């Protein structure tokens, strides 16, 4: 009995690899996966140019994304 944004906070962490990633404001890189936002953490690597990264540790942002 969850909305769809606890719904997100409460989901595992991810170990993976995806494109259409995209960066943060704040550096931060970003995924949409499943209706809901992860944020990467811990050792984070990227294409220099282009959309895929993988990282151990893809954690919810809790917001839940319409991109
Ligand atoms: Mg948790």
Redesign the pocket.
Known sequence: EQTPEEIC????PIDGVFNNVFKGDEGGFYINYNGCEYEATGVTVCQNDGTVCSSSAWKPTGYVPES
């Open positions: 906070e409460a989901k595992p």
